[PDB]
Every structure is written in C-alpha cells, then in structure tokens.
Curated annotation (Swiss-Prot):
Protein name (record): Cell division protein FtsZ
Taxonomic placement: Bacteria, Bacillati, Actinomycetota, Actinomycetes, Mycobacteriales
Claim: Transcription regulation is one of the keywords in the record: no
GO-annotated biological processes: division septum assembly; FtsZ-dependent cytokinesis; protein polymerization
Protein keywords: Cell cycle, Cell division, Cytoplasm, GTP-binding, Nucleotide-binding, Septation
Family: Belongs to the FtsZ family.
A GO term, aspect molecular function: GTPase activity
Residues binding GTP: G11, G12, G13, V14, N15, G98, T99, G100, E129, R133, D177
Keyword Cell wall biogenesis/degradation attributed: no
Organism of derivation: Mycobacterium tuberculosis (strain CDC 1551 / Oshkosh)
Record text on subunit structure and interactions: Homodimer. Polymerizes to form a dynamic ring structure in a strictly GTP-dependent manner. Interacts directly with several other division proteins.
Cellular location(s): Cytoplasm
Residues of the full protein shown: 8 to 312 of 379
GO cellular component labels: cell division site; cytoplasm
Length: 305
C-alpha cells in the first residue's frame, strides 16, 4: 500500500488541492504550501505550511519567482519532514506566479532525493494574463522539469476551447482546478482504487521515472458505446497535442462503476494501443468509482519526447 502525497504550492495549487478534496480524491495526503496566512485559512488540506514573510503585514501580492524560491529553501527541513517516507509525491501549481513558480522546483528536488517518484502537475497561464506571467511560467516550467521524474504541463488556453463561450474570469480558474485534479486522480486512482484490470505502483513507476516532459488528455461518455467514445475524446483532447504518437510511454486509466464491462475495457485498450507509436510502452488499468453512475472517464498521460 503506497504513501502518496499531493502538494499544492502557491495560490492556484492550493485552490486546486481544495477541488481535489471537495471532489473526494482518496488514498492521498494533501499538503498546502503558501506564503499568505489568509489564503491558507480557506484551505481544507490535512497539512498546511506558511512560508516566507507574514502575509498579515507587508507585500503578499507581488508575484516574484525569486521570492517564492528563497521562501521554499528556508523551509527545506520542514518540507522534507512533511514528505518523509512517501512513495509518490505530486507537486501541483499554477505556473506564472511567485510562490508556485519558484517554490515548486525546490519541493520536487526534495521529494526526489527522498527517493519518491516525483510528478509535477502544473498549468501554463492564460494568454490574457499577459506576457510577464507567460515568461515567468516558462522559466518555472524549465526549472521544475529538472526536479521532477515527470512533468505534466496543461496549457490553460486550451481549456477555453472546451469550456463554454460565455464563462466568467472565475469559472476559467475553476476549470483549471478541475483539470489539475483530473491529472492527479487519473494516475493515483489506478493505485488506490483499482478495478478488474489491476495496475500496481511498480508499473506506474516504470513508465514515469525519468520520463521528462509529459501531456494529458481526458474524455467521458454515457451508455451507448461509452468507453470507446470516452477514449476517443481523451486521445484527441486539445490538452494533448497532435503529439500522442510521439510518446515514448503512455499511461491510461478508465474509471467507471463496478459493472464496467470487460468488452468495453477492451475497446478502450485497443484504441490506445493503435493510437500510440508502435514502440511506445503502454500501461493501462481500470478504476472503480461508484460516484460516476453510468458515465465512464478515460485519462491518457503521454510522456517522453
Ligand atoms: N487552478 C487554479 N489556477 C489558478 C487560480 N488562480 C490563478 N491561477 C493560475 O496560477 C498562476 C499563478 O497564480 P498564483 O498561484 O495564485 O500565484 P502564486 O501563489 O504566487 O504562485 C496564475 O497566473 C494563474 O494562471 C485558481 O484559482 N486555480
């Protein structure tokens, strides 16, 4: 039984972790790291960690990656203790800010030296947030990639092509929350709550260790030929580029109720096998989830380029 910790660092990461908690992501410990005491108050994470300066006083708002990086190393001993003896560590953040952008590569480096399989799950900022954030996020991703075994990057721009035409500025970030959850849960659920086609940690570790940069796709469908449709949506998801075939490795999960048909599972499995490069390592499994009813959702992670 695996020890999996999910770290949400910076404002966005903490909000993402709250969505995960709110949605009932199980079998994982949630850690919230921030510089701001006030924002940490609204967090529902098991473990919270205030860092850097007091938010109750001076400059909480400034978004400097250098500030966030320094704050992290001033807490390296405390962080290491929170990640003590974990088998897997997820580092979720919204790239572009200060706390997340600079702090994340530190948290990951620590988790990796502890010997844990280190998976970063971050978002690229929306273009409407300006080039300054686009720039910072770009360096923050370069850095975090060095510290992770695998780094899944979700381009926020593509979420707007999926969400409704008339969405608020707040609905936009709720989608960002939801997709970060999708990334994490799509992987952890394979381990914590497997179905008929059982995948164990060793399989996942094999496909994700030193994988480098990675991308994800999600899909879901109902009733009539659902599993195939869901799988098809996932492999064609805009979040995943055309570069599904360019992947060295593919991790795939299909979640559904206890009554998830073997035939269904097989059709999804076959589709991904055909869609991926002939030489790619493909590991795939099923997840039991009664909260889905008669809907099934497929997650595809494509790694190694
Ligand atoms: N998932 C998610 N992402 C967010 C949210 N708010 C902002 N972001 C993204 O995260 C980036 C950094 O913001 P934030 O994490 O709040 O600043 P930081 O704490 O200094 O890292 C922004 O440029 C946004 O693209 C949110 O509520 N949820």
């Amino acid at each position: 039984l695996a020890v999996i910790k999910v770290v949400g660092i910076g404002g966005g990461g903490v909000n993402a972790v709250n969505r995960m908690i709110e949605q009932g992501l199980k079998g994982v410990e949630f850690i919230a790291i921030n510089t701001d005491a006030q924002a940490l108050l609204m967090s529902d994470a098991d473990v919270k960690l205030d860092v850097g300066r007091d938010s109750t006083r001076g400059l909480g708002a400034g978004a400097d990656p250098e500030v966030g990086r320094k704050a992290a190393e001033d807490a390296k001993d405390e962080i290491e203790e929170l990640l003590r003896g974990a088998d897997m560590v997820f580092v979720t953040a919204g790239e572009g800010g200060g706390t997340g952008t600079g702090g994340a590569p530190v948290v990951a480096s620590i988790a990796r030296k502890l010997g844990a399989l280190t998976v970063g799950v971050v978002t690229r900022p929306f273009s409407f947030e300006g080039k300054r954030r686009s720039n910072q996020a770009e360096n923050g991703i370069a850095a975090l990639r060095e510290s992770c075994d695998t780094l899944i990057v979700i381009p926020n721009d593509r979420l707007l092509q999926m969400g409704d035409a008339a969405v608020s500025l707040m609905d936009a970030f709720r989608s960002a929350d939801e997709v970060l959850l999708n990334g994490v849960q799509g992987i952890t659920d394979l381990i914590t709550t497997p179905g008929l086609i059982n995948v164990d940690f060793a399989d996942v570790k094999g496909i994700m260790s030193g994988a480098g940069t990675a991308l994800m796709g999600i899909g879901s469908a109902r009733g009539e030929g659902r599993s195939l449709k869901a799988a098809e949506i996932a492999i064609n998801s805009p979040l995943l580029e055309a570069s599904m075939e360019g992947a060295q490795g593919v991790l795939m999960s299909i979640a559904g109720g206890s009554d998830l048909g073997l035939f269904e599972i097989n059709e999804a499995a076959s589709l991904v096998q055909d869609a991926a490069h002939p030489d790619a390592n493909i590991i795939f499994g099923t997840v039991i989830d009664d909260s889905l009813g008669d809907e099934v959702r497929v997650t595809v992670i494509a790694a190694g380029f």
